[PDB]
Design an enzyme around this catalytic site. Structure first.
Site, PDB file in Angstrom:
ATOM      1  N   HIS A 197       0.921  -1.544  -0.327  1.00  0.00           N
ATOM      2  CA  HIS A 197      -0.064   0.076  -0.098  1.00  0.00           C
ATOM      3  C   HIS A 197       0.633   1.160  -0.019  1.00  0.00           C
ATOM      4  O   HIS A 197       0.926   1.986  -0.480  1.00  0.00           O
ATOM      5  CB  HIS A 197      -0.978  -0.018   1.358  1.00  0.00           C
ATOM      6  CG  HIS A 197      -1.622   0.978   1.087  1.00  0.00           C
ATOM      7  ND1 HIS A 197      -1.711   2.572   0.991  1.00  0.00           N
ATOM      8  CD2 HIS A 197      -3.314   1.109   0.936  1.00  0.00           C
ATOM      9  CE1 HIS A 197      -2.799   3.274   1.169  1.00  0.00           C
ATOM     10  NE2 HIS A 197      -3.764   2.806   1.672  1.00  0.00           N
TER      11      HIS A 197
ATOM     12  N   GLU B 136       8.478   5.857  -2.095  1.00  0.00           N
ATOM     13  CA  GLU B 136       9.610   4.861  -3.122  1.00  0.00           C
ATOM     14  C   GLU B 136      10.116   3.996  -2.450  1.00  0.00           C
ATOM     15  O   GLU B 136      10.191   3.650  -1.580  1.00  0.00           O
ATOM     16  CB  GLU B 136      10.617   6.149  -3.950  1.00  0.00           C
ATOM     17  CG  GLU B 136      11.490   6.682  -3.606  1.00  0.00           C
ATOM     18  CD  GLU B 136      12.254   8.039  -3.718  1.00  0.00           C
ATOM     19  OE1 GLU B 136      12.836   9.071  -3.153  1.00  0.00           O
ATOM     20  OE2 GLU B 136      11.477   8.297  -5.410  1.00  0.00           O
TER      21      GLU B 136
ATOM     22  N   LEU C 224      -4.589  -8.084   2.395  1.00  0.00           N
ATOM     23  CA  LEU C 224      -4.754  -8.863   2.979  1.00  0.00           C
ATOM     24  C   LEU C 224      -5.963  -8.816   1.885  1.00  0.00           C
ATOM     25  O   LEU C 224      -5.925 -10.110   1.187  1.00  0.00           O
ATOM     26  CB  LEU C 224      -5.362  -8.376   4.493  1.00  0.00           C
ATOM     27  CG  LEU C 224      -4.052  -8.692   5.258  1.00  0.00           C
ATOM     28  CD1 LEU C 224      -4.760  -7.642   6.787  1.00  0.00           C
ATOM     29  CD2 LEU C 224      -4.501 -10.116   5.298  1.00  0.00           C
ATOM     30  N   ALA C 225      -6.652  -8.486   1.544  1.00  0.00           N
ATOM     31  CA  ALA C 225      -8.023  -8.096   0.990  1.00  0.00           C
ATOM     32  C   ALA C 225      -8.030  -7.731  -0.763  1.00  0.00           C
ATOM     33  O   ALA C 225      -7.394  -6.936  -0.696  1.00  0.00           O
ATOM     34  CB  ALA C 225      -9.376  -8.158   1.416  1.00  0.00           C
ATOM     35  N   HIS C 226      -8.679  -8.039  -1.810  1.00  0.00           N
ATOM     36  CA  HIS C 226      -8.829  -7.587  -3.128  1.00  0.00           C
ATOM     37  C   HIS C 226      -9.343  -6.398  -2.453  1.00  0.00           C
ATOM     38  O   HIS C 226     -10.236  -6.109  -1.083  1.00  0.00           O
ATOM     39  CB  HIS C 226      -9.877  -8.188  -3.975  1.00  0.00           C
ATOM     40  CG  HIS C 226      -9.151  -9.332  -4.673  1.00  0.00           C
ATOM     41  ND1 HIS C 226      -8.080  -8.298  -5.268  1.00  0.00           N
ATOM     42  CD2 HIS C 226      -8.947 -10.225  -4.857  1.00  0.00           C
ATOM     43  CE1 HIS C 226      -7.375  -9.404  -6.114  1.00  0.00           C
ATOM     44  NE2 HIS C 226      -8.074 -10.727  -5.723  1.00  0.00           N
ATOM     45  N   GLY C 227      -9.212  -5.451  -2.581  1.00  0.00           N
ATOM     46  CA  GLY C 227     -10.523  -3.675  -2.809  1.00  0.00           C
ATOM     47  C   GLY C 227      -9.946  -2.895  -4.145  1.00  0.00           C
ATOM     48  O   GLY C 227      -8.850  -2.900  -5.076  1.00  0.00           O
ATOM     49  N   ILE C 228     -10.061  -1.524  -3.520  1.00  0.00           N
ATOM     50  CA  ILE C 228     -10.022  -0.460  -5.251  1.00  0.00           C
ATOM     51  C   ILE C 228      -8.253  -0.154  -5.543  1.00  0.00           C
ATOM     52  O   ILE C 228      -8.374  -0.156  -6.692  1.00  0.00           O
ATOM     53  CB  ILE C 228     -10.300   1.110  -4.422  1.00  0.00           C
ATOM     54  CG1 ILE C 228     -11.711   0.961  -4.400  1.00  0.00           C
ATOM     55  CG2 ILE C 228      -9.708   1.901  -5.041  1.00  0.00           C
ATOM     56  CD1 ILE C 228     -12.883   0.902  -3.077  1.00  0.00           C
ATOM     57  N   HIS C 229      -7.685  -0.926  -4.556  1.00  0.00           N
ATOM     58  CA  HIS C 229      -6.328  -0.972  -4.825  1.00  0.00           C
ATOM     59  C   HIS C 229      -5.665  -1.666  -6.099  1.00  0.00           C
ATOM     60  O   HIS C 229      -5.274  -1.828  -6.487  1.00  0.00           O
ATOM     61  CB  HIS C 229      -5.285  -0.447  -3.803  1.00  0.00           C
ATOM     62  CG  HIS C 229      -5.998   0.589  -2.855  1.00  0.00           C
ATOM     63  ND1 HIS C 229      -5.684   1.972  -3.120  1.00  0.00           N
ATOM     64  CD2 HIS C 229      -5.575   1.216  -1.579  1.00  0.00           C
ATOM     65  CE1 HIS C 229      -6.035   2.370  -2.644  1.00  0.00           C
ATOM     66  NE2 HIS C 229      -6.261   2.779  -1.314  1.00  0.00           N
TER      67      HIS C 229
END
Lengths: 121, 121
Positions: B9, B45, B70-75
């Site tokens: 992230h 960076e 951990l999970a799928h998301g928007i990212h």
């Protein structure tokens, strides 16, 4: 006597809640804790205050809160200890102890998982 | 020939990058991959495009990208496949393929870790 609250980020997409639900069900299968609840920090329910209240209502006096996050960040250092009333700056628990545990970190098991995922296992 | 890019992230706090650095070093000590690089989606960076370019410059033709989330998301569903040009909105040369892997999910290993963390191990 003792409850485990798993707490996760939460999202507008459903995956994040679904992962907490699955993880809670797996610790239930282990039969280690009398009480197990989940709580999402943002935009999903149950919320962290609800998960904690629900644990009290079930008669937990020791509440173990585990942040299901990879690393410390703003969430685990500001917002969550706030929501748990651990920090001087919408809920209070009266006479019971919250034990706020650590995130997952760079555990060797995470590198096993990553290596699996890298091979599409 | 093959490179592993771990992507995470990123935060304004340093823990998120430090965890990727630790995780990269642990996979390096395993000696599985010729090339291993890290990339942070935001605020830090190296960035995801830099991590991928670095892997190409080292002569990787197959680039395994593992989202350390951990999970799928928007990212993991919008932003990252964007940054990897995997989704029509970074000049990956055609002679290279990016292989975008899955996140961590509700792995049994994550419930072992959570149970450890719940006992302050």
């Amino acid at each position: 006597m003792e409850a485990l609250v798993l707490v996760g980020h939460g999202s507008r997409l459903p995956y994040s809640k679904e992962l907490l639900v699955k993880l809670a069900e797996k610790v239930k299968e282990r039969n280690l804790f009398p009480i197990v609840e989940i709580g999402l920090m943002e935009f999903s329910e149950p919320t962290i205050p609800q998960a904690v209240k629900k644990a009290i209502e079930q008669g937990a006096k020791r509440i173990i809160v585990v942040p299901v996050f990879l690393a410390h960040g703003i969430h685990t250092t500001r917002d969550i200890p706030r929501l748990l009333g651990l920090i001087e700056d919408l809920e209070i628990p009266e006479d019971v102890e919250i034990i706020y545990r650590e995130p997952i970190g760079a555990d060797d098991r995470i590198v096993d998982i990553i290596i699996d995922r890298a091979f599409g296992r």
